[PDB]
Write an enzyme that holds these catalytic residues in place. Sequence first.
Site, short mmCIF file in Angstrom:
data_model
loop_
_atom_site.label_atom_id
_atom_site.label_comp_id
_atom_site.label_asym_id
_atom_site.label_seq_id
_atom_site.Cartn_x
_atom_site.Cartn_y
_atom_site.Cartn_z
N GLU A 35 55.15 1.62 -19.64
CA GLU A 35 55.73 1.34 -18.34
C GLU A 35 56.53 0.05 -18.32
O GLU A 35 57.65 0.02 -17.79
CB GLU A 35 54.63 1.24 -17.27
CG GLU A 35 53.99 2.56 -16.86
CD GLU A 35 54.95 3.52 -16.17
OE1 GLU A 35 56.06 3.12 -15.79
OE2 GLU A 35 54.56 4.70 -16.01
N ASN A 46 65.02 2.48 -8.34
CA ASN A 46 65.29 3.91 -8.41
C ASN A 46 66.38 4.21 -7.39
O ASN A 46 66.10 4.41 -6.20
CB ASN A 46 64.02 4.70 -8.08
CG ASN A 46 62.88 4.42 -9.05
OD1 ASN A 46 62.97 4.75 -10.24
ND2 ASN A 46 61.82 3.79 -8.55
N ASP A 49 66.12 7.39 -4.84
CA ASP A 49 65.34 7.43 -3.60
C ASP A 49 65.12 6.09 -2.89
O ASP A 49 64.34 6.01 -1.95
CB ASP A 49 63.99 8.13 -3.84
CG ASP A 49 63.16 7.47 -4.93
OD1 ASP A 49 63.23 6.24 -5.09
OD2 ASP A 49 62.42 8.21 -5.62
N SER A 51 63.56 3.41 -3.87
CA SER A 51 62.28 2.74 -4.12
C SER A 51 62.39 1.90 -5.39
O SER A 51 63.30 2.09 -6.20
CB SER A 51 61.14 3.75 -4.25
OG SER A 51 61.26 4.49 -5.45
N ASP A 53 60.00 0.07 -8.70
CA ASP A 53 58.73 0.01 -9.44
C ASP A 53 58.53 -1.45 -9.82
O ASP A 53 59.43 -2.09 -10.36
CB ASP A 53 58.80 0.89 -10.68
CG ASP A 53 58.98 2.36 -10.35
OD1 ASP A 53 58.30 2.84 -9.41
OD2 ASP A 53 59.78 3.03 -11.02
N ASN A 60 55.01 1.80 -7.64
CA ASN A 60 56.08 2.15 -6.71
C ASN A 60 55.95 1.64 -5.27
O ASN A 60 54.88 1.72 -4.66
CB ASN A 60 56.28 3.66 -6.71
CG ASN A 60 57.59 4.09 -6.07
OD1 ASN A 60 57.62 4.50 -4.91
ND2 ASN A 60 58.68 4.01 -6.83
#
Length: 130
Positions: A35, A46, A49, A51, A53, A60
Amino acid sequence: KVFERCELARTLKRLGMDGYRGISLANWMCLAKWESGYNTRATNYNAGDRSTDYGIFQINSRYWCNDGKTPGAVNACHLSCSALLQDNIADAVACAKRVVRDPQGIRAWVAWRNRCQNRDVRQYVQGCGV
């Protein structure tokens, strides 16, 4: 902060991650590796959408932490996403524990399915004294 493999392994064990909700320490290590590369400052936007991380576990902003700019935010961890960018991973661990309390468990992270599931993950904790 970019953690050294065994340093992180010992830190996660002290924080009670080994066997939490049936998830072995090696699985948590495999997750962190893919990750963020063990980097607490990692952030990924992202564009699809809106959002983002955050942190070592790439948690998220739509469901777990609040950053104020993500539409439909739930903030299940009751934490500012800023808390997930600290060198001290206590808050990130508390939130990660919350994520796996949901039905999907560690499968909540797609990277775990792609890089960790059904694989020999012993290499992530080998020789760390955990």
